[model samples]
Target chain A: DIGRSSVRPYLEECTRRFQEMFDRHVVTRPTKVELTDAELREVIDDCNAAVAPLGKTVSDERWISYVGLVLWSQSPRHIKDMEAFKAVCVLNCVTFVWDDMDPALHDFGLFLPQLRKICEKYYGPEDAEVAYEAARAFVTSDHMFRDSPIKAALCTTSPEQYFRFRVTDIGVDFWMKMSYPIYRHPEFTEHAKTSLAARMTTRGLTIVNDFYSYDREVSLGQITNCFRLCDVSDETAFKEFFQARLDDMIEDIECIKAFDQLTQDVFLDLIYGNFVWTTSN
Target chain B: IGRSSVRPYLEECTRRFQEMFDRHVVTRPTKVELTDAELREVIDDCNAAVAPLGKTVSDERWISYVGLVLWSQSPRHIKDMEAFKAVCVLNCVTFVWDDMDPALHDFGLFLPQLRKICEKYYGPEDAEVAYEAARAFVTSDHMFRDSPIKAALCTTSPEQYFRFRVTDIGVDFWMKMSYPIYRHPEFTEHAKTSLAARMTTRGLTIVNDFYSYDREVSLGQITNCFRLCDVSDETAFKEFFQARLDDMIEDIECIKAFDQLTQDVFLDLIYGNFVWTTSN
Candidate 1:
């Protein structure tokens, strides 16, 4: 319990990492994971904010581990705000490709029926196709139509015919689906990544064949930064620290999901090709 | 009469009225027999493509010179390709139009979009009735799930709706718009037989080819486009031919044998030109 004075410098550093990761993916797609060390330190540091409450007393250290099991991943202050946020998350999760069956956000699944009400404002029966598509994207996946001021404001009605086409997931998935067979050749893949997005509006359907780089966010470097705020006290207490670390991992996972920055389509890839990753001591 | 060099090779169009279309098909009298006189005028007034040129001409100077040959319209060049064709085919949605009404489309103006296509090509028995069926087809905005045919070709107009801005389209996509028409099995065959019988009476029928579609909310439009596309190169054409051509032909011919079977609309659509008579 390094209270009123010890190690304040390290704590501040971790805070910055989590804040940065949250900020980066919230607005747009996350950058590749070739993150800097300083960035990582911040993520781990952010996790520490939770333990900072427990001074250096052995009891406080024990409490950090106990809280790891019992504490809320998100701040309780956001319970109300999270109701809407959770619903959106669950809605997006519906399409998240769980072991094959849908594993979207069940926490907010109850609020889905209300989606009809939200959709009613976007259009009427005439807009069935539009509603079906947008609703499919929204209800089936854990993503949102993220744009600024737009992201700032929650619409009483649905957005566009393709409101579910988030640049992160839908946009990414849309491109990836096309890049496979049609753009199988090298020249085609290059042409798609470059030119397709240029005449996107006029050459509307052409976009289906183009793609963005999906190989971006798969490194420990960025993970470190994203986990920076996940405070792991240096009590040399390895066991207690690990449990706390797991909770920090949970926070990072939430952040990724909240923004629909889902990386690694586990089930999707499993269908195409089996990928077995095993870890050992 | 030294100037009266014999108008050689003139064959008298003496075949009598088994199903006479000459009197009504054309608006005014001309060397040609079946097309209406105001057909050109109707095309000019209502069809934005023919209206601009006052007639359909490919490289020729006037409609009279080309004689229902070719015209300037949307979809730019029939020979040119499109980029989105691949997706359209996989989904069975063809988003293309032609610069001219191809060959048979020159028959007249008042026909519906599909009928114009039907005129270009039709099957053995259902030629006449299919024309009316084609007309009714375009009048229905959405093809219902239970529609008779699984596939259909539709468009706005060549020049107005489908035009190619870029010349660098891939080899595969170019053929989709030009070469093949829509592909369907059961439905198209039925349309062919039924459409043939209906054309016998032209404007009036005791029992029209197909029932009159609800046209008020229907914004169906697809045949102002007519162009001889270089179908030889289109993958869509080959795919259909390899997979469906033989089956379609067999089923269609069999479907036509029904004493009930009328004209062959689908056959005429692909092969170009089918004729029908009441057998009176």
Candidate 2:
């Protein structure tokens, strides 16, 4: 184990530089749209109303926290679409419930139809195509929870193999798709989905998630994480890995030339907002 | 009265297209037509392509279409015939899925097969890219099929039509497929939305919509841009086609930067499709 006395300053410096660079380059700062306690209660109520029929309940704390993240990450215009926003809230709620549920109780077969129905109701048929696809990918990754190479004791896997599964496991693709629900701009969504900037963003988000969850996972004896897979034990290696991923993300974001201003702004929001959420709580 | 005047523009456009084709394409465009036996053999080879997924191509015309397009587009660059046929078979399966009734089209059923076929042909890493392209195509195609725009194609504005048609045309899918098929490096976003690349896709769509107008109209499909632009008549159609031809030529001439090989591939697709369409 590394000494916290020596490692603390280096960690702080690395984080400070990352925040500085992100603020300098990203046009939008991560700001949560204030939802009143009453409004928050209503959102949770709405989610429960939708999920109760499926024989599940959401963790209010998790739902509320995730709603805060959504409020930060999503475009203001998207949030204004009440139906889409409520639908997204429900989707996130069910996802959390699905995660907490036992593997034996996993009835995603039933959940998918409900998901598709909700998406079609909120997003309409055209947008629902993509929404369903995104949700399906998310649910499908849940299968990994039951049987994955990472589940093995003392799991040893290549970094490449670990990352391929990690991207899906982290639900970056699903979240990325959710970012554009109300826009009626599937072309841009498709472009963003396949772009280098998006790829780097996915990688960056995965690192942030693993970094934050590392301690909890370690405590729980979870072996499937970047720090473990890559043998990142010390503060020095952790900071290096974190900085390198962020730098690559920033470079790709800077180099992307095709996206319109709106698309660029959304990517910025995702990067800044995800980091904010991870750090805040 | 408009027919006689339109002829001159048509002739001029044809000459310009030939000139541009000659400037960029190193190899002459090859138009491939498979006989019945050859088509059957291709279909049989593709049987293995779909057998793993428990699907088969029942539509012979669809298989033929994939075969002809595959062979004619970049025959010179097809280093591996089996891999090329694998791609063609996968296309046939997707095409069948595209043509299926919407209620019958199952995303869960087809996505795995799509991934498996791509992995078989392009290997795991390239398969992910190819699968993404395929997945995008499938979803976009579904969106277009379910869109109200199709019902209101003629009544829709140009901006609205193009917003759907850009992805609906499958240019991005085919262009991305070139990376794996021709084994060229994938283009950066800068290269993808470059003036030359944009013009190439625009030109290809124009040529496709122009050539397929008659057949589509006869079959009660009014999804063609020519119809939307109200240029169904020979005079207006020819004039509009030439105007686009001019725009593409000018755009190609003014291209500031793009990969030479990628540009060549785009040119090859445009030139080859034009040749194949006109000849057929």
Candidate 3:
């Protein structure tokens, strides 16, 4: 049996190796952006107030860390625009809170329209439209899993079914669109090439996320994990699978010539910075 | 003109709609011409393909709709017997699944069967895409069934209705599936999220809604855009649909980044869908 004593060292080693790969490939690191302690408090307080009427609250330490780290890692440039950054931060807070709620209880009718107003206030109409699309996709995909008639049989489902769900449920498309408020090139925002790369990045992100959050999710009695779904019984095999998936993603990203240099840099920063943040926590 | 003007107005709109397609679509690709015997043979093949899954297309009307749609949407595949049969199987499955009373049967039963059929016909990568699209289609259908907008007096705004409409129409699945089958996976990957592609999807939905308005109304379904827009008068609804159709075309044409092939594919899908709907 794989106990904590055996797993801790393996996880640490995997993290160290992944960081090395990330450093080698990612040329443009996110310039670390930090919110002052007072600013952090203000943002959290404001976010809680915004969602208070929706019968949701954001109080988890990890969720608070996530708001800062995700913004720093994913949208460092956008962070300069404090209003837009705050909008996205509150969005992240709401999304985190929503993730824990039962799917049947989700009132997207109430949540999404309010989300659109918030997004449109900071981002212009075009970016707001993209944000709305992403948010809808995220919630819809989440609801699909919970409401799926085959939910009970998902663990034993095909890899295709597992991935089809995970790709959207990971919220990569939504998260990537949140960074669009500051993206200079609106053309590439929904460009197919960007989607292809983003999808690969999402797969990589899902692996790392599932890997890191496996224990926490398991402790919380969550059954949706790579080990369970993919039937990976051994930690060693799962790590190997994770490494291979990331390697393929990196190679795929390198070969993609569809995006211009600037967009490519953004992609690299996102992929590598995501790993950095995932490892940091 | 004042008495029973609704019928005249709708007839005029349909004529102009045909004209719009003719003007914008420079070269409409000819559908694969199949003799009655050949078409029946293909239908038989489709039936045989799905027989293992315990599905049959016994209705002549459904058979014709499936055949015409497959012929129109996938002319290239129709020329190749095996590919045509594979596509036919998928179309048949989709038609059956889409029309099934969700209350009577578990839609999830079709997923594994679909996955198997997709794997048999396509490369593993493409097969996954096909399966994913089918799964998404089913999931979206479920959402449509559960949507509050279906309530007769539910006050859903046009904007809110459209947000749901875009996904509910189940066009993206077929559109995405078309990419791989059309052997333009790169184009599919590139154009899937483009404004042009999205506009094309919306265009398809508008077209479907316009064509299916009568059928849906007869079936007591009030979830269509015509109903939501509150244009109950036939003439007024036709005018509303025309305005939407014009906007959709204008939006699609304005996007310069959409490739010629992409545009051609979209036009074909829009045209094929229109033809299929009208035929039935």
Question: Which candidate leads the pack in lDDT?
Answer: 2
Instruction: Say which candidate scores most in DockQ.
Output: 2
Model 3: pairs clashing at backbone N, Cα or C within 3 Å: A192-B190
Model 3 agreement with the true structure over B1-280: per-residue lDDT tens digits: 1121233355665677677767766445456565677566656655554466566667574566565456456464332344344455666767776676677446545677777767766776556656665665666566446443234212343433433444456555555455555665334543244322344555566667666666676677655666655454666666676667766565445322345555566667666666665556
* lDDT of candidate 1 at residue A26, scale 0 to 100: 30
Those runs of model 1 whose alpha carbons end farther than 4 Å from true positions after fitting are A1-91, A97-128, A131-281, B1-280
TM-score of each: 0.20, 0.51, 0.49
Off by over 4 Å in 3: A1-9, A34-42, A59-63, A75-83, A102-105, A147-161, A192-194, A219-223, A229-236, A256-258, B1-280
DockQ of each: 0.02, 0.04, 0.02
Of 2 and 3, the candidate ranking higher by lDDT: 2
Cα displacement (Å) at residue A10, model 3? 2.3
lDDT head-to-head 1 vs 3, winner: 3
lDDT of 3 by residue, A1-281 (tens): 22221234467777877676666666556655566777577667756765666787557485577675555555455334566566667777778777867766778777777677667776776556656666665665566445343333333343333433454567766776766555555333433213333444555566667778876766665656654553245666766766665665565355432345555556666666767777776
The alpha-carbon RMSD over the true interface for every model, in angstroms, is 24.6, 16.2, 19.1
Top-TM-score candidate index: 2
Worst 10 residues of 1 chain A by lDDT: A272-281
State candidate 3's DockQ. 0.02
Q: What is the Cα-based lDDT of residue A135 in candidate 3?
A: 69
